Write an enzyme that holds these catalytic residues in place. Structure first.
Site, PDB file in Angstrom:
ATOM      1  N   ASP A   1       1.260 -14.717 -21.817  1.00 45.90           N
ATOM      2  CA  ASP A   1       2.394 -13.386 -21.932  1.00 45.90           C
ATOM      3  C   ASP A   1       1.514 -12.201 -21.855  1.00 45.90           C
TER       4      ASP A   1
ATOM      5  N   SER B   1       1.636  -5.755 -21.643  1.00 47.91           N
ATOM      6  CA  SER B   1       2.747  -6.689 -22.218  1.00 47.91           C
ATOM      7  C   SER B   1       3.902  -6.835 -21.077  1.00 47.91           C
ATOM      8  N   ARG B   2       4.368  -8.713 -21.603  1.00 43.30           N
ATOM      9  CA  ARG B   2       5.167  -8.682 -20.877  1.00 43.30           C
ATOM     10  C   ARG B   2       6.515  -8.854 -20.914  1.00 43.30           C
ATOM     11  N   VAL B   3       6.511  -8.835 -22.542  1.00 41.94           N
ATOM     12  CA  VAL B   3       7.759  -9.143 -23.363  1.00 41.94           C
ATOM     13  C   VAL B   3       7.849  -7.427 -24.369  1.00 41.94           C
ATOM     14  N   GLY B   4       7.016  -6.272 -23.641  1.00 40.90           N
ATOM     15  CA  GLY B   4       7.480  -4.701 -24.106  1.00 40.90           C
ATOM     16  C   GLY B   4       8.198  -5.185 -25.009  1.00 40.90           C
TER      17      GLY B   4
END
Lengths: 62, 50, 499, 56, 470
Positions: C341, C366-369
């Site tokens: 992720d 970043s996929r949660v940011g």
């Protein structure tokens, strides 16, 4: 048990005795001390220098 | 200093072959009979303790 | 004598084991002993040879069990009794692995005495359930301004670090640990990240340097280094991330947080390849075993931010994959990229161009940011994302007759890029990340000449400490910038910029 | 002393301007700088006559 | 030699399977001697196939092997002899003189296998080796006890680079050196042997400061593979017991990979990527791990590597790339430009180059150089289409400095008097930092490009300018 027997007998009954100083010496650097700081001799003796410098010097502009 | 330390290590390996010499002595001795018998009865006792 | 004491230790070994299952090697070649016996063997049993070598039993075939030696063939020979320890692989897990360098077995390779650990627990154990997992509300700060803002990282979060070979690959990882000294000092155990570095491949000399650096920065006092070095055997290397994870579970389960960095999983892959081909197990894409994916997925899903019923704890992870030519298309990278992720992708051109860290923002994601980002830092770096995007596009329009608008972008962009450069092994606090980026965002420093950016930066930090370390502490403690703080901060920046 | 030597050396660059044709200024300057620096690195290189007998 | 007698069962290649009798067990990694008119054919036991039937790898040729030929077992890893007359003689895989200076003095013997020293044992490098090759010193400074790696072309002065190193560094340091050739030509061997007799490093009366272990490529693959292990133990004898630092030199380690690749296939073990050993990583790793800076002795390997088809992302060079402390790439292009050395400066990178480590000035200068060259490289493309005709005065000056720097790199070598006929130059570390600093500052932007070409230090750059000026 067997460990005790082998070891006890071995340690007790057999002990190496250290080798000659010569054998240790042979495998290591023996040592010889360096000599002299360096003493050079007096140079540019007599009026050879005096004459040479006075005449040689004319390294000025004209 | 280096060979002095080395001689100690060399001594451990010397004493290793002296252990080997003692191994041959044990195997020459009727410790070969008597301590093998000791092992035999010990194994019987152990195996009985199972 | 040293001899007498050593014998005394041997003398205390005379216990006999009435071995319920014994096996005898039929033939041992290739480190693949094929043993006759061992009918009661459980899969992946730890087995102890006559040589004392330990093994696992990947192939259980009916007549012979093809044990894989964890040791070396030099001390193994045919016919040998193969005692069955009869316990599937387990490694000590517990508190006292902090500041300890251990090999996979759990033996200290730093040799700083016996391990302090509370239990030995299996390492093939599975990952936290869906319901046992809840969102990452926690950020984590590495002390790198760009990483923390552009690619903000959280806790119990897995994000890849895929990049060019050892070009400060290790440096990026170490930087996080150094900022974690600050957080470690911090009492809350969500901020006490008990880091685990898993040195896979990396030779003992290289890891010795790591160790020395870590000792120098006193990082050892929460660090754990699971070390599977080049000399260390490929089964040990294979089970090394799995083993490391188990140590992490103790922290995670305890509700505490920790960060495990698998570096580099690419060398783990090669070890599995070596094993598989030697076990005649089917090779697969890029001659890596087909179920190499299955391994990586199991490992990387163990890491996770648990549910609050699960004691609110986590195991943050940051896997490192080394891309030998930037080949993300390569089978092991593609697989990992899906699982992870986020990715951080460092670019060689940037490295060469002296941008060290050589991070390339475009291929970093970043996929949660912002879920795992400081609110203050979010505010003053939304702009930064947009600005840099323009700078990248207008970097290639830097090549004659160019509009004023284009030139403004270039001035702002070059200066920002220079601002986000950071000398290796310098971590930072979030309360000093926020001011510098705010200034750049407001273009105060974009006005200031490129050459003078560096001197300004350090001066600005000292100036901020002098003028208002109240502001800095407030920024740190409030964590959210009030309009009044942004006003006051702007004033301070203005005052500084004027000098 | 040594500080006199270098101070006079740079002075002589602008003195030699007044009487250009120098060719033993270079020999004087090269020699004094060289041996000053050479003896300085010799003296910094020095391990005075010392041997362990405490440890070794 | 244990009365384990085996009769050959299958000659199918180097792989020779032997059939030791019942009630007599061999052990992996033993040494079998087979009486032959080839002396003793040495077989390294590499597998057991059970029923006292082994599968062993031959060292020497298998021609004329008689079916069922009695095979004595001498046991354990082959033990060569080591001594200090190891120095100054060429030694084959099975540990016998090739220069026929009689048998090496066998004070001790040691097995060719040895195990890497433990993590605890390791003592880390932190000292700077000097090569006297300016580009190498500035842009990839080497470090004592390091693991230098000479990735490079087809003997494209690969040997020459090493010859220069031996001339400068080897002779300079009092420690021993071991020059090891894995699968190298007897033409090259004769040149090197003759050359190093000439440079006197090899003294055939009196001790040599180098030893040689030349394994050549006519030898069967098995012998080619296990020559390296032998060499390592010699270094270990020096490293440990004599205590002396070893400036190891090995050639060529792609040949080590290739030799191993062949016997992987022959052993029946399925070869991994690009046909390399399945155990490629660990075999490289064990070799590399054995070589290290140890408290007993700091070992500084210089390992030649041949980049097959100049592709270093091929798994064999790429895997080795990790294990090497101080990588260096020697490229054809730079040689062709007429710049000697042929080193590609961007790609040659040593681990130590850190700012404090090499000193702030050295670092800053090198950062400026790196930028100057990188800028020039960027501008080469621009020059390609646009031309240098609309790129800044500053850019032009940076380019001008780069051409000057490019030919400043052109520095001759004493060992390319053989080639070019131009005596080399040794430039002090401090002097190199100074000379690069001056150029960047633009102090020498009045100096001709050809007055940087093929010269040494600062004095030389000026002097060749003076020569042209006249």
């Amino acid at each position: 048990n067997v460990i005790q027997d082998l070891y006890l007998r071995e340690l007790k009954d057999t002990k190496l005795a250290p080798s000659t100083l010569q054998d240790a010496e042979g495998n290591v650097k023996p040592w010889n001390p360096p000599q002299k700081p360096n003493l050079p001799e007096l140079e540019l003796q007599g009026p050879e220098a005096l004459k040479a410098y006075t005449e040689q010097n004319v390294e000025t502009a004209h | 200093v280096r060979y002095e330390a080395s001689l100690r290590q060399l001594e451990q390996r010397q004493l290793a072959k002296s252990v080997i010499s003692r191994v041959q002595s044990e195997l020459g001795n009727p410790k070969f009979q008597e301590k093998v018998l000791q092992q035999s009865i010990s194994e019987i006792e152990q195996l009985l303790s199972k | 004598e040293v001899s007498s004491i050593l014998e005394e230790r041997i003398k205390g070994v005379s216990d006999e084991a009435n071995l319920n299952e014994t096996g005898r090697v039929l033939a041992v070649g290739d480190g693949i002993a094929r043993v006759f016996g061992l009918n009661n063997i459980q899969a992946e049993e730890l087995v102890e040879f006559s040589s004392g070598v330990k093994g696992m039993a990947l192939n259980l075939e009916p007549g012979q069990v093809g044990i894989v030696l964890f040791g070396s063939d030099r001390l193994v020979k045919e016919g040998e009794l193969v005692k069955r320890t009869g316990n599937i692989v387990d490694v000590p897990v517990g508190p006292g692995l902090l500041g300890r360098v251990v090999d996979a077995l759990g033996n200290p390779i730093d040799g700083k005495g016996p391990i302090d650990a509370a239990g030995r627990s299996r390492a093939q154990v599975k990952a936290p359930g869906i319901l046992p997992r809840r969102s990452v509300h926690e950020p984590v700060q590495t002390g790198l301004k760009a990483v923390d803002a552009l690619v903000p990282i959280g806790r119990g979060q897995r994000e890849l670090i895929i990049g060019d070979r050892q070009t400060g690959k290790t440096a990026v990882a170490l930087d996080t640990i150094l900022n974690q000294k600050r957080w470690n000092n911090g009492s809350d155990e969500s901020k006490k990240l008990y880091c685990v570095y898993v040195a896979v491949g990396q030779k003992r000399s290289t890891v010795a340097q790591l160790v020395q650096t870590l000792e120098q920065h006193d990082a050892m006092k929460y660090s754990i280094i699971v070390a599977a070095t080049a000399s260390e055997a490929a089964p040990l290397q294979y089970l090394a991330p799995f083993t490391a994870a188990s140590i992490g579970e103790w922290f995670r389960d305890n509700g505490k947080h920790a960060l495990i960095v698998y570096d580099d999983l690419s060398k783990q892959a090669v070890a599995y390849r070596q094993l598989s081909l030697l076990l005649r197990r089917p090779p697969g894409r890029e001659a890596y075993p087909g179920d190499v994916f299955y391994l990586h997925s199991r490992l990387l899903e163990r890491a996770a931010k648990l549910s609050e019923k699960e004691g609110s704890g986590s195991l943050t992870a940051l896997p490192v994959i080394e891309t030998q030519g930037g080949d993300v298309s390569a089978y092991i990278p593609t697989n990992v990229i899906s699982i992870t992720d986020g990715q951080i992708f460092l670019e060689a051109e940037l490295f060469y161009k002296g941008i060290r860290p050589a991070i390339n923002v475009g291929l970093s994601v970043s996929r949660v940011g912002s879920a795992a980002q400081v609110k203050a830092l979010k505010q003053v770096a939304g702009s930064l994302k947009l600005f840099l995007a323009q700078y990248r596009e207008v970097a290639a329009f830097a090549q004659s007759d160019l509009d004023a608008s284009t030139k403004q972008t270039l001035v702002r962009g070059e200066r920002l890029t220079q601002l986000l450069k950071q000398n290796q092994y310098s971590p930072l606090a979030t309360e000093e990340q926020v001011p510098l980026i705010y200034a750049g965002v407001n273009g105060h420093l974009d006005g200031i000449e490129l050459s003078r950016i560096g001197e300004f930066e350090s001066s600005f930090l000292s100036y901020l400490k002098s003028n208002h370390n109240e502001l800095l502490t407030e920024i740190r403690e409030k964590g959210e910038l009030s309009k009044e703080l942004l006003a006051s901060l702007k004033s301070a920046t203005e005052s500084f910029v004027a000098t | 002393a040594k500080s006199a030597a270098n101070k006079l050396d740079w002075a002589k660059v602008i003195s030699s301007l007044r009487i250009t044709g120098s060719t033993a200024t270079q020999l004087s300057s090269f020699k004094k700088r060289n041996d000053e620096a050479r003896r300085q690195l010799l003296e910094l290189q020095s391990q005075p006559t010392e041997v362990d007998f405490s440890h070794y | 030699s244990t009365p384990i007698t085996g009769k050959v069962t299958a000659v199918i290649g180097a792989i020779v399977d032997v059939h030791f009798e019942q009630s007599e067990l061999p052990a992996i990694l033993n040494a079998l001697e087979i009486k032959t008119p080839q002396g003793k054919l040495v077989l390294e036991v590499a597998q057991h196939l059970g029923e006292n039937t082994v599968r062993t790898i031959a060292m020497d040729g298998t021609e004329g092997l008689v079916r069922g030929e009695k095979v004595l077992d001498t046991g354990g890893p082959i033990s060569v002899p080591v001594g200090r007359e190891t120095l100054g003689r060429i030694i084959n895989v099975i540990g016998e003189p090739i220069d026929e200076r009689g048998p090496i003095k066998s004070k001790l013997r040691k097995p060719i296998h040895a195990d890497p020293p433990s993590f605890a044992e390791q003592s880390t490098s932190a000292e700077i080796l000097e090569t006297g090759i300016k580009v190498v010193d500035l842009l990839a400074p080497y470090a004592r006890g390091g693991k230098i790696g000479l990735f490079g072309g087809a003997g494209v002065g690969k040997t020459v680079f090493i010859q220069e190193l031996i001339n400068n560094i080897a002779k300079a340091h009092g420690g021993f050196s071991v020059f090891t050739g894995v699968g190298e030509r007897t033409r090259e061997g004769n040149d090197l042997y003759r050359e190093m007799k000439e440079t006197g490093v090899i003294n055939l009366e009196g001790e040599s400061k180098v030893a040689l272990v030349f394994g050549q490529m006519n030898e069967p693959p098995g012998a080619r593979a296990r020559v390296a292990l032998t060499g390592l133990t010699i270094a270990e004898y020096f490293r440990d017991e004599e205590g002396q630092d070893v400036l190891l030199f090995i050639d060529n380690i792609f040949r080590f990979t290739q030799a191993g690749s062949e016997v992987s296939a022959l052993l029946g073990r399925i070869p991994s990527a690009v046909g390399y050993q399945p155990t490629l990583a660990t075999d490289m790793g064990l070799l590399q791990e054995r070589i290290t800076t140890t408290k007993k002795g700091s070992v500084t390997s210089v390992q030649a590597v041949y980049v097959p088809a100049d592709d270093l992302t091929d798994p064999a060079p790429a895997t080795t790339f990790a294990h090497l402390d101080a990588t260096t790439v020697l490229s054809r292009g730079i040689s062709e430009l007429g710049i000697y050395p042929a080193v590609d400066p961007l790609d040659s990178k040593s681990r130590l180059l850190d700012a404090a480590v090499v000193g702030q000035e050295h670092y800053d200068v090198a950062s400026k150089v790196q930028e100057t060259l990188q800028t020039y490289k960027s501008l080469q493309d621009i020059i390609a289409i646009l031309g240098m005709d609309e790129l800044s005065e500053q850019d032009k000056l940076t380019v001008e400095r780069a051409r000057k720097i490019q030919r400043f790199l052109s520095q001759p070598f004493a060992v390319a008097e053989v080639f070019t006929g131009i005596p080399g130059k040794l430039v002090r570390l401090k002097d190199t930092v100074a000379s690069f600093k001056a150029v960047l500052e633009g102090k020498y932007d009045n100096i001709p490009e050809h007055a940087f070409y093929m010269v040494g230090g600062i004095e030389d750059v000026v002097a060749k300018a003076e020569k042209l000026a006249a």
